[PDB]
């Protein structure tokens, strides 16, 4: 059973929800002491400005973070990507919570939180997003993840925040929504060769390649890289566009500069400036390659795509073209927000991995993937 998650303020796996609100009240006194690590390990707050700890953190994630179903690929988050994901506005070094071996100080554990204004049905609440929970392989199946969770929970409590958001590939108590990954092949030769995909039968490699053939320049009129001058309208666009869904982020203009302004190998944003000079739509997609075990699949991930005048269909087509042009092998989009209307039509394939969304210390009705409006790295 769930011996750890039965002690937490989350709804049970089976209960249907009819209420809105916290599971437990905000705490007026918080444990000042770090939790106990098993004999031989200590806590450490990782200062990512130090390139040495940043690399240690990178080596740790590259060697021990998430793998797929058949243990064939592993995320290969880079230093600069981790700096982008772990230092958004309002980040804290204390929330970069690593575990080291007391004797040798080697990094063997990690969990992180970042602050985020979250809107859920009718409530806007200050929460945190929890990502990169990682424990070294030699240290699994012995209760370090629960301790990581309780220590980060404590450290969030100390700052006065009592709710969280996080995703997971595993079913826990209790998913607020279940989403599914779909993939659009860009370089099928490499994809079939490394077993990311397979020749769907009664078909050839040459026929397959002509299936995923794409145009070499985009369709939409007035597409260009996002620029500094665009931070206000993107923010505007996003804010209005996100009001239809039931679980969304609430970004200040700064968080928009951080999350969407383009960076080599990390995030790419393209805006649509029309004949009148008004930006009206934008697309976004980030860079996360996975190590090929037994050399490197390059993947682009749909982030936020806002449409007010260009059809989303064309916007995502041009996204596929842009990714193709930048040297990516595959384009992965979830099925949340309005993505169901273009996944089949643009020839995406369904993946085997699910993505469960969870709220910590918040009771609410679950939603269908179409109302989830949040994309985490």
């Amino acid at each position: 059973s769930y011996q750890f998650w039965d002690t937490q303020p989350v709804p049970k796996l089976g209960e249907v929800v009819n209420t809105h609100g916290p599971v437990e009240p905000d705490k007026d006194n918080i444990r000042q002491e770090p939790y106990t690590l098993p004999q031989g390990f200590t806590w450490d707050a990782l200062d990512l400005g130090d390139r040495g700890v940043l690399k240690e953190l990178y080596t740790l994630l590259n060697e021990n973070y998430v793998e797929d179903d058949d243990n064939m690929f592993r995320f290969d988050y880079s230093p600069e990507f981790l700096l982008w994901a772990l230092r958004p506005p309002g980040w804290l070094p204390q929330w970069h919570c690593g575990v080291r071996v007391v004797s040798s100080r080697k990094l063997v554990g990690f969990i992180s939180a970042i602050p985020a204004n979250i809107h859920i049905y009718d409530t806007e609440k200050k929460m945190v997003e929890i990502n990169f929970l990682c424990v070294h392989k030699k240290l699994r199946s012995k209760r370090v993840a629960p301790v990581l969770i309780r220590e980060i929970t404590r450290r969030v409590h100390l700052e006065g925040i009592f709710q969280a958001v996080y995703t997971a590939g595993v079913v826990l108590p209790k998913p607020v929504g279940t989403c599914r990954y779909w993939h659009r092949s860009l370089n099928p030769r490499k994809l079939i060769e490394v077993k990311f995909s397979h020749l769907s039968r009664n078909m050839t490699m040459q026929r397959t390649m002509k299936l995923y053939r794409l145009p070499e320049t985009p369709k939409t009129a007035g597409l260009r890289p996002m620029e500094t001058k665009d931070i206000p309208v993107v923010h505007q666009l996003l804010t209005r566009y996100l009001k239809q869904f039931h679980l969304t982020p609430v970004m200040s203009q700064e968080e928009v500069e951080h999350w969407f302004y383009p960076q080599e190998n990390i995030i790419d944003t393209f805006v649509v400036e029309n004949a009148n000079g008004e930006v009206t739509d934008f697309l976004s997609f980030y860079t996360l390659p996975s190590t090929i075990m037994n050399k490197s699949l390059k993947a682009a991930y749909s982030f936020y795509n806002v449409h007010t005048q260009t059809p989303l269909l064309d916007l995502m087509s041009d996204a596929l073209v842009l990714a193709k042009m930048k040297g990516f092998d595959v384009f992965n989009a979830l099925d949340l927000m309005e993505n169901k209307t273009f996944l089949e039509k643009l020839k995406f394939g369904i993946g085997d991995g699910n993505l469960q969304y969870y709220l910590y210390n918040w009771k609410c009705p679950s939603m269908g993937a179409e109302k989830v409006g949040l994309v985490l790295q």
Binding site: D68, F73, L191, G351, D352, Q377
Partner: peptide, 8 residues
Amino acid sequence: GKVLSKIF
């Protein structure tokens, strides 16, 4: 992401 998926 979190889920390392591939083509089903």
